[PDB]
Chain length 128, copies 3
């Protein structure tokens, strides 16, 4: 299976091949400064068409907090197969626990794909 | 595959069907006000019997922080198949980074199911 | 059926027990750790593991971690790859404290499961989607 990837512009660093099954590091599309106790969407400079029936999960890298002092406000970001449009660029939602600077090209988070949950039948009951 | 769902009461909004594999939005069962730097378990007004051998994963929605100023203290909630009792209602563990008000019926987080990890044995060794 | 090889820091580490029905598995603080409000500490878990080939592990807080200890996990979910299998590749829990707190040696502070790694994928650059 394959992922089609469109970059925001030619200066974005092309990301790792995916022949191995490791999570894949994504990078700041531009410089982003965030003050202590403030929030910014860090653009990742990439848009993707994921395989039919899959979704992507995005979390911080292990070293992100140590080096940048940010947490990811939504814990883990879900990118559905449907977020496949020409302007559907990815972002990393960052809350700074201290004044910080992220520079263009800095690796800031990581992703993998996973099969979406199967079709399920929700049936209401009065008791369990 | 089916999930049996019990709602806290008649006023809880019945949630989305699960035909497409998308994550499913869960909603506040009552008004909850949270002060900056305080914590509250936000009731979701649902109890579920998940399919055998499955667990649920719960994370904020992408827009939760922007709209509500809360993060999920456990990052991703994991609800086991065994949490299927008639009083086993679900909660979103919220920490407010600013004063906030959540209203009854607001979408606050999302879940999916996933198969539990395969059978595995833990074997102590004296060296790797 | 599959196997996880687990090695402990020392004999004082309380050995981990697997939940027979496939539940996530709790891990324990390897030593006492004091963390001041708004400070960070990489809490040692006192375990190194060789995971099954083609698998990874996922680490999240327990539901009770915040109530008990007032900490959040700064990386959201830890990813432990199959390759992190060396004799000195000990696991940690990266804790940010939202209040002054003390964690005691042996406290169950986080939980893990394994999951198959994503399959091989071909990344293909395109000009438009
Ligand atoms: O951490 C995230 C979470 C989401 N998205 C993308 C995928 C979503 O489809 C879109 C937001 O749409 P809603 O989920 O808010 O509809 O943003 C990200 O780039 N990063
Ligand atoms: O984000 C979560 C995580 C867990 N639970 C369920 C399953 C737990 O067994 C139960 C109670 O958790 P503790 O009181 O053991 O933390 O809540 C949730 O509703 N939300
Ligand atoms: O919450 C975590 C996340 C990672 N690790 C381990 C596995 C990683 O291989 C290593 C850090 O390596 P990088 O991911 O920074 O390469 O730490 C942990 O013990 N706990
Ligand atoms: Na990369
Ligand atoms: Na609605
Ligand atoms: Na102990």
């Amino acid at each position: 299976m394959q992922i089609k990837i469109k970059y925001l512009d030619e200066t974005q660093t092309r990301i790792n091949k995916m022949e191995q099954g490791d999570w894949i590091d994504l990078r700041a599309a531009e410089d982003v400064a965030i003050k202590k106790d403030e929030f910014k969407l860090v653009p990742l400079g990439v848009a993707m068409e994921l395989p039919e029936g899959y979704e992507a999960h995005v979390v911080p890298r292990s070293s992100t907090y140590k080096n940048f002092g940010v947490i990811q406000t939504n814990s883990m970001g879900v990118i559905d197969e449907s977020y496949k449009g020409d302007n559907d660029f990815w972002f990393f939602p960052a809350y700074a626990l201290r004044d910080t600077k992220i520079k263009k090209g800095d690796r800031i988070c990581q992703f993998r794909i996973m099969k979406k949950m199967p079709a399920v039948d929700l049936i209401e009951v009065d008791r369990l």
